[PDB]
Amino acid sequence: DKKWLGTPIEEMRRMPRCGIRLPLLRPSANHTVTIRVDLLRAGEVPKPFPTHYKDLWDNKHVKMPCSEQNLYPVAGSRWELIQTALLNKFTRPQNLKDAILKYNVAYSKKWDFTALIDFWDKVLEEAEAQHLYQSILPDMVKIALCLPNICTQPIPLLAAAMNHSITMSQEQIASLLANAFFCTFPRRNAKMKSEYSSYPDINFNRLFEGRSSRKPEKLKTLFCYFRRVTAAAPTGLVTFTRQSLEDFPEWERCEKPLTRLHVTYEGTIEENGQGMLQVDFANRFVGGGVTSAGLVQEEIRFLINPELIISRLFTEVLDHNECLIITGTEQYSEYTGYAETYRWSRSHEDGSERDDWQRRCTEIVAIDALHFRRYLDQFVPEKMRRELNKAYCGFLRPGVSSENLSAVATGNWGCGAFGGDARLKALIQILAAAAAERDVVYFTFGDSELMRDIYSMHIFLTERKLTVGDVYKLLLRYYNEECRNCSTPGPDIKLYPFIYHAVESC
Ligand SMILES: Nc1ncnc2c1ncn2[C@@H]1O[C@H](COP(=O)(O)OP(=O)(O)OC[C@@H]2C[C@@H](O)CN2)[C@@H](O)[C@H]1O
């Protein structure tokens, strides 16, 4: 045999149908809202609040390109320079390189534009190139230069240990991302920077470097988005929430029972996870290498739903106890392949319903696993506890009862690029979801043996009525008996065989 095992997917909970009704949208101490809630209507472009541009240039807010404090030593206005540079007509790729470098002179040797030049000159056909420089690029410039009429309210940084939300319009995000494309955000470039060293890259200069064969596919994917959002203004909202928990369960003592499992070797988190909490296998610097050379699970999601990318403008590097939750991003592209075989396939028309805040009914959580360079390192209790607490923070929704929480749509978190063991991580996610009172929908991404192994272990543990704490104690025993005093690189016996023996022996 079967393509899926466990509980039928029809019997799992989904949004917004399992959704609480939303409370009224309102600005508060822990929620920044950048549009007029009183004027928010389905099918209408949201109105910025406030009506006129207000600037903050300080250690707690985004440094906007259009700030009067964005100055260049000649002090002149850098925003005036950006406007003059970008309002020239482009007919050849050198023109675009030269424009970006007019307000980035310190990087005129360091930033390579080979990928941009090759895309324009050596990938596109003539009519496609013409469309790019006659239509798409000038439309992008115009939405970028409208920034102070669109993003009128200062955007707070979602800094370390903040529990805070930002809700902004898809139109505001389009203007911001056009700016990132033209690399206009100040103080976000120097490799020896201080203020923003703990923030991800936002400006898109590394998208334009080198000769990776995947750069044309990343550019096709982003130009699909920019072509659609400059042609017809998008009408919905997107919320970005930083969440930080203080109190974690005492896992060894947790008496909660396991929840339900559906596990399948067909399908993906993004297509088969509708109405479910969709996991992003993140970097602690959210978005990973999306605007540089990365092209695995996180980067692909950030390309096909590009509104995710703007999280990099204001989300500080995640600590152990933190996650980011993004609600309302839209899917603009379809893809084939993965990593070095990734291709843009076509435009996607998102058919998601919107909630009462005009957000697409798509909820994504970024949780970063640890990057293990040795196999045995992940079985150390400290490290197991770390992964449990991370996943718990991602799954937990303080205030909300269990019957209003959708299933988690997840899979082989930490077990590709980050070197984790899928059988351990599967159990870690099962326990975290149990403590958060959510069911699990687990995609094994073509591994049919792994599907049968996860199913068999879950139903073994469930039938014996083992608690979260019972299971965690078995993890601690595997560590003590097979890993702690182990000389060799791999242990003598595997986790699942150990568990079956320990329980059946008792
Ligand atoms: N779309 C997908 N749906 C379900 N599973 C997927 C999907 N895409 C990839 N996978 C599976 O998930 C595994 C792990 O994906 P990776 O992206 O390598 O994740 P992980 O090891 O946590 O690496 C984290 C870093 C940090 C990110 O910025 C970039 N990659 C892959 O080896 C596949 O088996």
Residue numbers in the entry: 450 to 523, 532 to 963
Question: What does the primary publication say about this deposited structure?
Answer:
Protein ADP-ribosylation is a highly dynamic post-translational modification. For example, linkages to glutamate/aspartate are hydrolyzed by macrodomain proteins (Jankevicius et al., 2013, Rosenthal et al., 2013, Sharifi et al., 2013), whereas linkages to arginine and serine are cleaved by ARH1 and ARH3, respectively, two members of the structurally unrelated (ADP-ribosyl)hydrolases (ARHs) family (Fontana et al., 2017, Moss et al., 1988).
In order to probe whether the differences between the active sites have an effect on substrate recognition, we used the ADPr analogues adenosine diphosphate (hydroxymethyl)pyrrolidinediol (ADP-HPD) and -monoalcohol (ADP-HPM). These compounds were originally designed as PARG inhibitors and contain pyrrolidine instead of the distal ribose as well as differing in the number of hydroxyl substituents. This mode of inhibition stands in contrast to the structural studies on ADP-HPD as a PARG inhibitor (Kim et al., 2012, Lambrecht et al., 2015, Tucker et al., 2012). This conformation is further stabilized by extensive contacts between the Phe875 containing loop and the pyrophosphate moiety. PARG activity appears to decrease with decreasing chain length and only low activity against oligomers of fewer than five units could be detected (Barkauskaite et al., 2013, Hatakeyama et al., 1986, Uchida et al., 1993).
